[PDB]
């Protein structure tokens, strides 16, 4: 009835050089190339039909395969004229639906295009944001208690609320089990804040780092199509 058909487009290393995922595809009208993004990939929410290009790929041709007619215009326009053949991923015959998601996997090492970066750039802003709010909570919490415990015992009622929050950890209280409470809060805060921070790292590490793909494959683009 209705189902999500996962279609993949893979670009590998050939004996004739590396394949490219791109909108820069020869032998196809503007009609086809029109529907694709700067990165040669179809737009999410597109109403695609059999034949339409979902992911633009290209493959190097190699001497043997060059018609003298193209050897000539290669000489006229420069090496990268008729360098490659269209091997992009199209929608199979008969099938029809609407793209609801695309997923780009890039191997460790490959240059990240514009599309990829913006996405990467965005996921960083968040990973970071997630931390600020995480930290805001951590402070607003523990520090509400430090005050409480602080006031109770050695009250600076109004005085305390002035000096920046970072100056509270400084102030001390009449030796007492109430100083040991102020001890742990300090430890806890730092220990935790640290932990939360080294989590932002492990996040950035993953975001930028390449994907563990098979040997030979450079990048994989998985299109998710809703077929009725």
């Amino acid at each position: 009835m209705i189902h999500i058909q996962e279609l993949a487009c893979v670009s590998r290393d050939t004996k004739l050089g590396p394949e490219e995922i791109t909108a820069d595809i020869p032998n196809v009208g503007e009609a086809a190339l029109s529907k694709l993004d700067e990165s040669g990939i179809v737009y999410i929410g597109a109403e695609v039909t059999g034949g339409d290009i979902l992911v633009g790929k290209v493959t190097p041709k190699g001497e043997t395969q060059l018609t003298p007619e193209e050897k000539l215009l290669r000489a006229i326009f420069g090496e990268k004229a008729s360098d490659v053949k269209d091997s992009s991923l199209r929608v199979p015959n008969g099938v029809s639906g609407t793209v609801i998601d695309v997923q780009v996997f890039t191997r460790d090492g490959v240059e990240k295009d514009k599309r990829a970066l913006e996405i990467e750039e965005m996921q960083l802003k968040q990973a970071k944001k997630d931390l600020s709010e995480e930290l805001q909570i951590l402070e607003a919490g523990l520090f509400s208690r430090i005050r409480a415990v602080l006031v109770a015992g050695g009250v600076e009622a109004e005085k305390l609320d002035k000096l920046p929050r970072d100056r509270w950890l400084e102030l001390g209280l009449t030796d007492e089990e109430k100083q040991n409470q102020l001890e742990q809060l300090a430890e806890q805060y730092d220990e935790l804040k640290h932990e939360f921070e080294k989590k932002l790292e492990a996040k950035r590490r993953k975001i930028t780092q390449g994907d563990d793909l098979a040997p030979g494959v450079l990048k994989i683009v998985k299109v998710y199509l809703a077929v009725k």
């Binding site: 909108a23 820069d24 595809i25 020869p26 326009f77 420069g78 004229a81 008729s82």
Partner: peptide, 8 residues
């Protein structure tokens, strides 16, 4: 005839 990459 589109014998060339749009790029060129």
């Amino acid at each position: 005839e589109n014998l060339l990459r749009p790029s060129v």
